Amino acid sequence: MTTLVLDNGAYNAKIGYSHENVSVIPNCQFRSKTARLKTFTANQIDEIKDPSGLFYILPFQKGYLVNWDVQRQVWDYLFGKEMYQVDFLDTNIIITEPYFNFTSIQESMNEILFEEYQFQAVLRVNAGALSAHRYFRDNPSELCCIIVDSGYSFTHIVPYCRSKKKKEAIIRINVGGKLLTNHLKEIISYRQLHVMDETHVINQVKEDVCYVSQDFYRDMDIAKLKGEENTVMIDYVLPDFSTIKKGFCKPREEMVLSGKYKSGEQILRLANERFAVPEILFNPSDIGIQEMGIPEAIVYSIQNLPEEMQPHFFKNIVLTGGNSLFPGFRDRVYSEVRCLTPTDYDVSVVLPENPITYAWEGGKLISENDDFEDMVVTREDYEENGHSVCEEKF
Amino acid sequence: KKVRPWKWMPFTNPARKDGAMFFHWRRAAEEGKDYPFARFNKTVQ
Amino acid sequence: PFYLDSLEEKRKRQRSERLERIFQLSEAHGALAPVYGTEVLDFCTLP
Amino acid sequence: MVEKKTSVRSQDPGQRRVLDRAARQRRINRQLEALENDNFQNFQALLEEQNLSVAEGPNYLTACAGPPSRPQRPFCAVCGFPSPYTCVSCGARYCTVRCLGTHQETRCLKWTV
Amino acid sequence: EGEVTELTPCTISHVIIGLKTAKGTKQLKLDPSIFESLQKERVEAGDVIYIEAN
């Protein structure tokens, strides 16, 4: 039989069955100021011929849930067609849950899942736990691993050892991809005008041009010196949905250094943001937050009890999420943890080759674990125990 | 950046069987789209 | 979990290097003797 | 000769005033809350209901990372480049006199209400 | 050679010092006679130092 693996958050709602449906389906609804205020669903955004000024209705604005209505509408619109083949009791679903989520909200979500959609089985596995299982299956010779999941709206430093997570050296950081996108928005707004509040185009510009600087102060000096010499001043032409529907970074050759083009686009752009907005993950607190970076917590998480886990912990660092898509992020994290951790202890940091849907891969690989029928809680068990069997099983 | 002219576009109603062609001031986005009121064709049983 | 053979061997080898370093330094810090000596200077020195 | 009509919105230096600590902290908190938010330039009630039943233990409170060891770097608020200076009025940082002027014209004490 | 991360003298049997470079961190046990040199050089957490074993 097939199963439906579901990961959910503020930016993305990745659902997928045993074989296909691998994509970046969002979780929020979109309202177009121009399309008569029509309320679009996760994948219906593709039907919008002009995503400029889309109002986002979010079930999650950060790690926790809000306004069930939106989540249930998204789930219904997804199931209603090819995505899941609404058949309910024929298959089962496996949903992820945040590191420390609302106990009441999560048990009520399980209640709704058992009652309304009536999946024959569902469980309380954790988003980090699924990635931990994936990594353990990839490397059976390993016994302990730390997951740095820097999602688009998440930053979790989660340990795992002996197939059990400890709730003491477990760190979360509020510096997420959404914060980075909002900071880029505010910077562009402040440096081109006094107000600018579009989100959809800048969220793409983020992943298109931003990169993690391997030498922050060197890049800062290169940006401080005049643009005639710097290389990070790559200009980005924004989309207008009338001549080009998707923005793009102009070739290094076509760049007119005067910053003005007779074509008439909003190409205006600066170099600083490109490498300033990603480094907030590594060296935060520059803007004012009391939030700590990635590496110091990657360190703090290791040195609690075990001198036998500490070495395996350094050797097994699993960087995943969505914020690890910028080039140089892996190298920077590796250099930082290598310079922060003891020399004698080995430190191996390896990000996968295609970690765009690592959670879906873990789910599709667990689909044939021959123990899911025991890991999962079923309809009758739920109805009889009343959330107790669900709290027991994860 | 303004490109979306309203046009006096022809259209056909799938609910009809004679293929009669009518006209309407449609937008520049839903050209050739199905007739929205076509749902109102549930004749009595 | 179990320990690492490579890690424990590296620990042993760095400890051996440490022991060799003490053996070298202790022997090098006492190679030369005084020209006159503390007691010789104290005997030669008058009030 | 054409008479150039001047503006009357100029403010008296005798009336202009310096800022304080609480208001600067509120500025910082508002800026961070806006950076965390996503809408025109609610989860507040969400976190209120959350903290309604929070205690000390393995939870969000004891899970937050906290402040780092490396000291805060003085980045600019206008252009973002390293800012060795500060604004005597509000404390904002800058790197050039042009940046200071832009701050005084667009940011200095105009959003605090 | 490297940046100091911690100084702890154990009337002193030795001093444990933490050094940092771009190859990892190192914990070092120095004779109490070198703790005098450390105090005289006024080194503290965050300063880069050379300490010759010889």
DSSP string, A223-245: HHS-TTT-S----EEPP-SSS-S
DSSP summary character for residue A26: B
Chain A residues touching residue C6 (CB < 8 angstroms): 346
C:13-32 residues touching chain E, CB 8 A cutoff: 21, 25
Q: Which residue of C has its CA nearest to E52?
A: C25
**CA-based nearest residue to A2, from A88, A64, A90:** A90
Contact D36, A179 (CB under 8 A): yes
Q: Which of A163, A346, A347, A348 to mutate to test the interface with C (most CBs of C within 10 A)?
A: A346
Interface size, chain A vs chain B, as Cβ–Cβ contacts under 8 Å: 6
Other C-beta atoms lying within 10 Å of the C-beta of residue D73: 15
Q: CB distance A240–B2 less than 8 Å?
A: no
Residues near B22 by Cβ (< 8 Å), separated by ≥ 6? B10, B11, B12, B13
CA distance E15 to chain C (A): 16
C5 has a chain A CB within 8 A of its CB: no
Interface size, chain A vs chain C, as Cβ–Cβ contacts under 8 Å: 22
Residues near B20 by Cβ (< 8 Å), separated by ≥ 6? B12, B13
Give the integer Cα–Cα distance in Å for A53 and A30.
Answer: 10
Is D64 annotated as belonging to a binding site? no
Contact B2, A34 (CB under 8 A): no
Give the integer Cα–Cα distance in Å for A103 and A204.
Answer: 34
Contact A149, A127 (CB under 8 A): yes
Is D76 annotated as belonging to a binding site? yes
A:270-299 residues touching chain D, CB 8 A cutoff: 272-273, 276, 283-293, 296-297
**CA-based nearest residue to A377, from A96, A124, A116:** A124
Give the integer Cα–Cα distance in Å for A292 and E6.
Answer: 20
Which residues does E contribute to its contact with A (CB < 8 Å)?
Answer: 20-27
DSSP string over A91-146: SEEEE---TT--HHHHHHHHHHIIIII--SEE----HHHHHHHHHHHH-TT--EEE
Q: Which residues pair with A4 in a beta bridge?
A: A93
A263 has a chain B CB within 8 A of its CB: no
CA distance C3 to chain A (A): 6
Kind and range of the H or E element at E3?
A: strand E2-9
How many CA atoms are closer than 13 Å to the CA of A334, on its beta-carbon side?
A: 16
Pairing mode of beta strands E48-49, E2-9: antiparallel
Contact D76, D94 (CB under 8 A): yes
Structure determination method: cryo-EM
Q: Which residues pair with A57 in a beta bridge?
A: A29
Give the integer Cα–Cα distance in Å for A55 and A199.
Answer: 9
What letter represents residue A87's amino acid?
A: D
Give the integer Cα–Cα distance in Å for A281 and A150.
Answer: 9
For residue A164, give the 3-state DSSP assignment: strand
Q: Which of D31, D33, D40, D43 to mutate to test the interface with A (most CBs of A within 10 A)?
A: D43
**CA-based nearest residue to A151, from A107, A197, A106, A99:** A99
DSSP string over C1-47: ----HHHHHHHHHHHHHHHHHHHHHHHHTTSSPPSS-HHHHHHH---
Chain A residues touching residue B3 (CB < 8 angstroms): 242
Residues near A7 by Cβ (< 8 Å), separated by ≥ 6? A13, A14, A15, A95, A96, A127, A130, A359, A360
Give the integer Cα–Cα distance in Å for A49 and B29.
Answer: 8
Task: Give the 3-state DSSP-derived string for D41-86, with helices as H, strands as E and coil as C.
Answer: CCHHHHHHHHHCCCCCCCCHHHHECCCCCCCCCCECCCCCCECCEE
In our burial notation (b when 16+ CB lie closer than 10 A, e otherwise), range C21-39 reads eeeeeeeeeeeeeeeeeee
Which among E24, E26, E27 is the nearest to A338, CB-wise?
Answer: E24
A343 has a chain E CB within 8 A of its CB: yes
Chain E residues touching residue A345 (CB < 8 angstroms): 24
**CA-based nearest residue to A198, from A210, A185, A212:** A185
Q: Which residues pair with E2 in a beta bridge?
A: E49
With touching defined as 3 or more inter-chain CB pairs under 8 Å, the answer for chains E and A is yes
Resolution (A): 3.2
Q: Which of C2, C4, C9, C17 to mutate to test the interface with A (most CBs of A within 10 A)?
A: C4
Q: Which residue of E has its CA nearest to C28?
A: E54
A108 has a chain D CB within 8 A of its CB: no
For residue B30, give the 3-state DSSP assignment: coil
B5 has a chain A CB within 8 A of its CB: no
Full strand arrangement of the beta sheet holding A92-95: A13-16, A3-8, A92-95
How many CA atoms are closer than 13 Å to the CA of C26, on its beta-carbon side?
A: 6
The CATH code that applies to domain A177-282 is: 3.90.640.10
Is D103 annotated as belonging to a binding site? yes
Chain E residues touching residue C25 (CB < 8 angstroms): 53-54
What letter represents residue A371's amino acid?
A: D
